[model samples]
Target: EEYSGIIYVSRLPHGFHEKELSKYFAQFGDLKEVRLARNKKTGNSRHYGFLEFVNKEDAMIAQESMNNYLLMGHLLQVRVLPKGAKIEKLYKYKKRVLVEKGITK
Candidate 1:
């Protein structure tokens, strides 16, 4: 089966960079992507980001390793994206079009 892999990084510092975040997470395993959301107009960080790892195991390892850890004077919150499987299913519809068109692998 394909491994579901995604992470949500919350309570991040004001000026966290993607590279720095990746560097910290890479200690656990390979990362497929790292994206820090930001406000379009103000260009300020949203203080959260999405990180996709190579597999679920890596994501879980990263979460266990970093969750509640201190960083930038705040305890970081790292966990699997969307809180639960129900939320994942709710959001799955948006990806259905891509899957139907064979655009998603």
Candidate 2:
């Protein structure tokens, strides 16, 4: 039941910082926070990340409008985050550590 009005993004340029990510997505709506997935071996950026929006509606809007938004010479894939700890489960057990697993895991 810990579901949220969050956006799951993929295909981002490697090595993006949180503050930097906020600059691109915050324009869609107020962001509760921004994140960037990373690799365990190099500790560099992963191909995806998440954005926590304060408003559910805004999240959806951004998800639709910004799905192909480009930043830092990269095209992004954006969508509303799916239920559960799947993102975390895969990222952690798969072979990365930029983030432990979830939004705060």
Which candidate number maximizes lDDT? Answer: 1
The TM-score between candidate 1 and the true structure equals 0.71
What's the TM-score of every candidate structure? 0.71, 0.66
- The residue pairs found clashing in candidate 2 are none
Root-mean-square deviation (CA) per prediction: 8.4, 5.6
Model 1 C-alpha lDDT per residue in residues 1-105, reported as the tens digit of each score: 333577767678767768778988988898887876566689677676667887678888998998998987978887675333222332233334524743222
* Position 104, candidate 1: lDDT: 29
Predicted candidate 2 versus true structure: per-residue lDDT over 1-105, tens digit per residue: 345577777777756667766887788788876767667689777667777888867877888888877767887777675455244444454424423544322
* Model 2 poorest ten-residue lDDT run: 95-104
Model 1 alpha-carbon drift over 4 Å, by segment: 1-3, 82-105
Clash pairs (backbone) in predicted model 1:
none
Those runs of model 2 whose alpha carbons end farther than 4 Å from true positions after fitting are: 1-3, 70-73, 83-105
Q: What is the lDDT, from 0 to 100, of the residue 38 in candidate 1?
A: 62
Please estimate how well model 1 matches the true structure, expressed as its whole-model Cα lDDT. 0.68
